[PDB]
Amino acid sequence: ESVTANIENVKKVAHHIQKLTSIVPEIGIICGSGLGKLADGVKDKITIPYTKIPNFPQTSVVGHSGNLIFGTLSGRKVVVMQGRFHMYEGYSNDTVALPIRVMKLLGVKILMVSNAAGGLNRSLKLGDFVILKDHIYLPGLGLNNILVGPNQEAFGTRFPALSNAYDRDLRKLAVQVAEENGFGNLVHQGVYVMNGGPCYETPAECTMLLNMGCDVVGMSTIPEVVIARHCGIQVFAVSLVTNISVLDVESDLKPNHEEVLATGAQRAELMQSWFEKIIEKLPKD
Amino acid sequence: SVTANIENVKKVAHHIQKLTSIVPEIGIICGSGLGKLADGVKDKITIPYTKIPNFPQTSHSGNLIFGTLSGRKVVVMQGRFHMYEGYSNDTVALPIRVMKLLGVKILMVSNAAGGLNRSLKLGDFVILKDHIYLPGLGLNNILVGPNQEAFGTRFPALSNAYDRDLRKLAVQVAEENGFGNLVHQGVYVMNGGPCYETPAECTMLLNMGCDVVGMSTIPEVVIARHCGIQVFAVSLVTNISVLDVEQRAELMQSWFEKIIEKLPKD
Amino acid sequence: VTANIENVKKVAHHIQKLTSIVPEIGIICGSGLGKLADGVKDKITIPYTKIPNFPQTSHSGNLIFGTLSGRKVVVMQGRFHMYEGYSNDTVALPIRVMKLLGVKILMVSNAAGGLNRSLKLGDFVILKDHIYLPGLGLNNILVGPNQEAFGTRFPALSNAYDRDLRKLAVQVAEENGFGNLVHQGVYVMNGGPCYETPAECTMLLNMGCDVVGMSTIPEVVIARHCGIQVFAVSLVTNISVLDVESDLKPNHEEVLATGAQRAELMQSWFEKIIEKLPKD
Numbered sequence: 001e002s003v004t005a006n007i008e009n010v011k012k013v014a015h016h017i018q019k020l021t022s023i024v025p026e027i028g029i030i031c032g033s034g035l036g037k038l039a040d041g042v043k044d045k046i047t048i049p050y051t052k053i054p055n056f057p058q059t060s061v062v063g064h065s066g067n068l069i070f071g072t073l074s075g076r077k078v079v080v081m082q083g084r085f086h087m088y089e090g091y092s093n094d095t096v097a098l099p100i101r102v103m104k105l106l107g108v109k110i111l112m113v114s115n116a117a118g119g120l121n122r123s124l125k126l127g128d129f130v131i132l133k134d135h136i137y138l139p140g141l142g143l144n145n146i147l148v149g150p151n152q153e154a155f156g157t158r159f160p161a162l163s164n165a166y167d168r169d170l171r172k173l174a175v176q177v178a179e180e181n182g183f184g185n186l187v188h189q190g191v192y193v194m195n196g197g198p199c200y201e202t203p204a205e206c207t208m209l210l211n212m213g214c215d216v217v218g219m220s221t222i223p224e225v226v227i228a229r230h231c232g233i234q235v236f237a238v239s240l241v242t243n244i245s246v247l248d249v250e251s252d253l254k255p256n257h258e259e260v261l262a263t264g265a266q267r268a269e270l271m272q273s274w275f276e277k278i279i280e281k282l283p284k285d
Numbered sequence: 286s287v288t289a290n291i292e293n294v295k296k297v298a299h300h301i302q303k304l305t306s307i308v309p310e311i312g313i314i315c316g317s318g319l320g321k322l323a324d325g326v327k328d329k330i331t332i333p334y335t336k337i338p339n340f341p342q343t344s345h346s347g348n349l350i351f352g353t354l355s356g357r358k359v360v361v362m363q364g365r366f367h368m369y370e371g372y373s374n375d376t377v378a379l380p381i382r383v384m385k386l387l388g389v390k391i392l393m394v395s396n397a398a399g400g401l402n403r404s405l406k407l408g409d410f411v412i413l414k415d416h417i418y419l420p421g422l423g424l425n426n427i428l429v430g431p432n433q434e435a436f437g438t439r440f441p442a443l444s445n446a447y448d449r450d451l452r453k454l455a456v457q458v459a460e461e462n463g464f465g466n467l468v469h470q471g472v473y474v475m476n477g478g479p480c481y482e483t484p485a486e487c488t489m490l491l492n493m494g495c496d497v498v499g500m501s502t503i504p505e506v507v508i509a510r511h512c513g514i515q516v517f518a519v520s521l522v523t524n525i526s527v528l529d530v531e532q533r534a535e536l537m538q539s540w541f542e543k544i545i546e547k548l549p550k551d
Numbered sequence: 552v553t554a555n556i557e558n559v560k561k562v563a564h565h566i567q568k569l570t571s572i573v574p575e576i577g578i579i580c581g582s583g584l585g586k587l588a589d590g591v592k593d594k595i596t597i598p599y600t601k602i603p604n605f606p607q608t609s610h611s612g613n614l615i616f617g618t619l620s621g622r623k624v625v626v627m628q629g630r631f632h633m634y635e636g637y638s639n640d641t642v643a644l645p646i647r648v649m650k651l652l653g654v655k656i657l658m659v660s661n662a663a664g665g666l667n668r669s670l671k672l673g674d675f676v677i678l679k680d681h682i683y684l685p686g687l688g689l690n691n692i693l694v695g696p697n698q699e700a701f702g703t704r705f706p707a708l709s710n711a712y713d714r715d716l717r718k719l720a721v722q723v724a725e726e727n728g729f730g731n732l733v734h735q736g737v738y739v740m741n742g743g744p745c746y747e748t749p750a751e752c753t754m755l756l757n758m759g760c761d762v763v764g765m766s767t768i769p770e771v772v773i774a775r776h777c778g779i780q781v782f783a784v785s786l787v788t789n790i791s792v793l794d795v796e797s798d799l800k801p802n803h804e805e806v807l808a809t810g811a812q813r814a815e816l817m818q819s820w821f822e823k824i825i826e827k828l829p830k831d
C-alpha cells in the first residue's frame with residue numbers, strides 16, 4: 001500500500017512541496033490522453049520530479065519519472081500532474097489517493113482530468129470529446145473501491161455521495177467554450193465506465209457495457225475522481241475517443257495502444273486550447 | 286486475521302460456552318432499525334467482543350447478547366463487520382461460524398438499503414428473496430481461499446438461500462399485524478462500497494433486475510448457507526435511489542419478535 | 552514466484568533437461584478430458600512436485616509430454632483456480648512455461664452452467680468470446696507490472712478464441728456425427744466458489760452470456776498476451792436455474808458425473824482436431 005494517505009503523511013508531502021515553490025494552485029490538472037501539450041505550455045513554471053518529493057508515489061514512463069508542474073495557465077494558478085498512477089499497474093489505494101489529497105492541502109479547488117477511452121455509444125466518432133457527466137465504477141461496486149479500508153476523516157466522510165460528481169456548472173462552461181470556439185460538434189456528454197484493465201474489452205464485454213447505458217470505457221480516472229469528491233474538490237473530466245469499440249467477434253477490427261496514442265497526439269493541440277480557454281473562464285477569480 | 290477454521294472457531298465457541306449456559310437457536314444481526322430489539326431480550330447476558338479471545342473487534346465496542354426473546358433462546362450480534370472497512374474474509378466469517386458452533390439454526394438479518402425498484406417508498410420493508418453478489422462474481426467472494434471443510438462444501442449451492450418458508454411466515458406475521466402493505470420481497474445487490482451509488486450505477490443495477498442496494502449482508506448470508514444455517518433477511522428502504530444526473534426501526538424489531546414467536550422449534 | 556522471464560526460463564530449462572519433447576500444442580484438462588493423458592503415446596509424466604518453482608496443487612498435478620494424433624503435446628493435469636486463493640503469478644507461470652517450451656496452440660475444457668435456454672445437459676459450447684467479470688473489476692490476471700518479454704501492456708482480445716480453430720472443431724464434430732451437441736457461445740467468469748443464484752443467472756443471461764464458469768479466462772488472457780492461439784470448450788454440466796421459486800439446483804456430484812459421462816467423446820473430439828491441424 002506504500003505510505004498511508006492520512007493527514008500526517010499528506011501534510012508532510014504538501015509542506016515539502018511548498019518549500020520548492022511559491023505557486024499556490026487553485027486548479028489541478030491530471031494529464032491524460034491529449035493533454036501532453038497543455039502540460040508543456042504552463043507559464044512561469046517550476047517542475048518538480050516525483051523522485052525529488054519524499055513519500056510522493058513513484059511512477060515512470062519507460063524509466064522517466066513523472067513530474068508535478070506549477071505555474072499559470074490563462075493567468076490562473078495551476079498544478080499539473082504529468083504522470084498518473086493507474087490501478088492496472090498494481091498501485092495501492094493509498095498511492096493513487098495521496099496526490100489528490102496533497103492537491104487539496106495545497107489549495108486546489110477544481111480538478112480537470114482527461115483520459116483515453118473506447119467509444120461504445122454508436123454515434124461517437126474517432127477523436128470526439130466526451131465530457132463525463134456520470135460514471136460506473138465496476139471495480140468499486142466489486143470490493144475494489146479506492147476508499148475501501150479505514151476512512152481518513154480529515155479528508156472526507158465514511159460514505160461519500162456522488163450525486164453531482166461531475167460538476168454540472170463546469171460541464172456547462174466547457175460546452176459553451178467549445179461552441180464559442182467552433183468545435184461544439186466534437187463535444188458530447190456521457191457515462192464513463194471503468195474496466196480495471198489492462199486488457200482491452202472483448203466484443204461481448206463492449207456489448208454488455210453499451211447495454212448497461214455506458215457511452216465510453218476506459219481504465220482510469222474514476223478512482224482519482226472519487227478521492228477528489230471525497231475531499232470536496234470540484235471535478236471536470238473528459239474522455240477523448242481514441243478508438244471505436246468493436247461489438248462483434250467476427251470483426252477483424254482490433255484495439256491497439258499505438259493508434260490510441262496517435263489519436264491522443266493528434267488531438268492534443270485542440271484539447272490544450274479547449275482547456276486553456278475553459279480555465280480562462282472558470283468561476284470566481 | 287485468525288483463519289475461520291474449525292479449530293479457531295471451536296476455541297472461540299468453547300470460550301463463550303463457559304460464559305453462558307444459553308444455547309442460542311436463533312442468531313440476530315440488527316443492521317437497520319435498530320438495535321432495540323436486543324431491545325427486549327430477557328435473562329440476558331451481555332458479552333463484549335473485547336472480552337472474547339481471538340474474536341474480531343469493532344473499529345462503542347460491540348457485544349454478543351444472549352438471552353430469550355419471544356420465548357426462544359437467541360444470540361444478538363451488536364456491531365457488524367463490513368468489507369468496505371477493510372476487514373478480511375476470515376474476520377467477517379468467524380462470527381457466523383461461531384454462531385453455528387453455539388447451536389444457531391436460523392439467522393435473521395436486517396439492513397438499510399437504497400430503493401432501486403420504482404414501486405418502493407421510504408420506510409418500505411424489502412424481504413430478500415435473492416441476491417446479486419457483485420464482489421463475489423468479481424473474485425472477492427468471502428469463500429475464496431482454501432475451503433474449511435468442517436463447515437461446508439467447496440462449491441455451495443445458493444438455492445433457497447433466503448428460506449422460502451421463513452419468507453412466507455414473515456409475510457403472514459406482517460399481514461396479521463396490519464402492516465402487510467409495507468412489505469415487499471426483492472433482490473438485494475451488494476455494492477462493495479463505501480461510496481453511495483451514482484445514478485448511472487443505480488440505473489444499471491435496476492436493469493440487472495435488482496430491487497434494493499446495500500453494502501453488507503451477502504457475505505454473512507453466504508457463510509451461513511455454507512454451514513447450513515437458514516437465513517431470513519430484510520432491507521429497510523432508507524432512501525430512494527436517484528436514476529438520472531439531471532421507529533420504522535421499532536416496527537421492524539417488533540416484526541422480528543413476532544416472527545420468532547412463530548418459528549418452528551425442534 | 553513472479554511469472555517473469557527469468558523465473559519462467561528457469562522452469563522451462565529444468566523441464567527441458569527431463570524431456571526432449573518440444574510441444575507445439577498445450578492442453579489444459581478440465582471437465583470431460585480426464586482420460587486424455589492415456590491416449591498420449593511415448594509419454595513422460597512429470598509431477599509438479601519434481602519441478603523447482605513450478606506451482607503446486609493437490610495427488611500432485613502432472614505435466615505429461617508426448618505424442619497425440621501424430622503431434623507433440625504437453626498436457627496439464629491439475630489446474631490453479633482463483634477461488635482456491637492462487638495468485639496471478641501462480642496461474643500465469645505454467646502458461647508462460649508452455650510458451651518458452653514451444654507451444655503455439657492451447658486447448659482447454661471446463662465445466663459450465665447452461666444459461667442459454669436452448670442448451671442441453673452434456674452439450675459442448677465452444678467459446679467464441681468471454682466476459683471476464685473479475686477482470687473488469689480490477690482482479691485481472693495481468694494487473695501489476697507488465698512482463699515485456701511475454702507481451703504488451705494493453706493486450707487486445709478481439710479474436711481471442713481463434714476462429715479458424717473454432718471452424719475446424721465444428722467441422723470435426725459434424726463429420727463425426729455429433730454436430731448436434733456443439734454450439735459456440737459467450738462464457739462469463741464467476742470468480743466463485745459459490746454456484747450462481749437465480750437472480751445472478753438471470754442477470755448473466757441478460758448480459759448476453761450463454762454459459763457461466765469459474766475458470767479458464769485467466770489462462771486464456773495469459774495465452775493471448777504471449778501470442779498463443781486458444782481453443783476452449785465448456786461442457787454443459789448443469790442447466791442454470793433462473794427461477795428462485797424452482798426446486799432444481801446445481802449439484803456438484805451431478806456436475807462431475809455429467810462431465811465424466813462425456814469424457815470419451817470429448818477425448819475423441821480433441822484428438823481428431825489435433826489430427827487435422829495444419830502442420831508444416
Ligand SMILES: Nc1[nH]c(=O)[nH]c(=O)c1Br
Nearest residue numbers: 116117118217218219260
Ligand atoms: N483507449 C482505450 N480504448 C478501448 O477500447 N478500451 C479502453 O479501456 C481504453 Br483506456
Ligand SMILES: Nc1[nH]c(=O)[nH]c(=O)c1Br
Nearest residue numbers: 397398399498499500523
Ligand atoms: N442506505 C443506502 N442508500 C443508497 O442509495 N445506497 C446504499 O448502498 C445504502 Br447502504
Ligand SMILES: Nc1[nH]c(=O)[nH]c(=O)c1Br
Nearest residue numbers: 662663664763764765788
Ligand atoms: N459447473 C458449473 N455450473 C454452474 O451453474 N456455474 C458454474 O460457475 C460452474 Br464451474
